[model samples]
Target: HMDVEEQIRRLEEVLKKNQPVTWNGTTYTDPNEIKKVIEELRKSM
Candidate 1:
């Protein structure tokens, strides 16, 4: 569904902007690890 895509895209948007994203209120920098997760999510979807 679109919601799933939205979830994946939101992370991508943050990565594209080179911005840190918060997870569990802790901020993470860079897209290295996130990129792998994104790819996996996209493929799984």
Candidate 2:
């Protein structure tokens, strides 16, 4: 029952907090890297 905007906001927080395989505080913008992080997260659940 999550609202759409709330879901988007939560994902935004995930991006900010995790930044997925970031280097020196700079986020890697590659699609593959982002997908890897997402896959790892799925395994956590």
Candidate 3:
């Protein structure tokens, strides 16, 4: 189990500090959007 809001806030803060981080060739400029996506994915579960 994970706290969605807290995780989002942490990711957002990291993204804010490092805008455009690359992982496995995929670059992300906004982690906040990713956080929202994560929340949406877990909505049913």
User: Which candidate tops lDDT?
Assistant: 1
**What does candidate 3's lDDT look like per residue over 6-31, in tens digits?**
64565566555756554434555677
Model 2 segments beyond 4 Å from truth?
1-26
Error of 3 at 8 (Å): 0.4
TM-score of each: 0.61, 0.40, 0.37
Q: lDDT by residue for model 2 over 1-45, one digit each (tens)?
A: 434454444445555565444434556566455555555545544
Candidate 1's residue-wise lDDT over 1-45, tens digit each? Answer: 545687688788888887777755556677875566577678866
Candidate 1 colliding pairs: none
The C-alpha RMSD of each candidate to the native structure, in angstroms, is: 2.7, 8.0, 4.5
Could you tell me the TM-score of candidate 2?
0.40
lDDT of 2: 0.51
- Candidate order by decreasing TM-score: 1, 2, 3
lDDT of each: 0.72, 0.51, 0.57
What lDDT score goes with residue 22 in model 3? Answer: 46
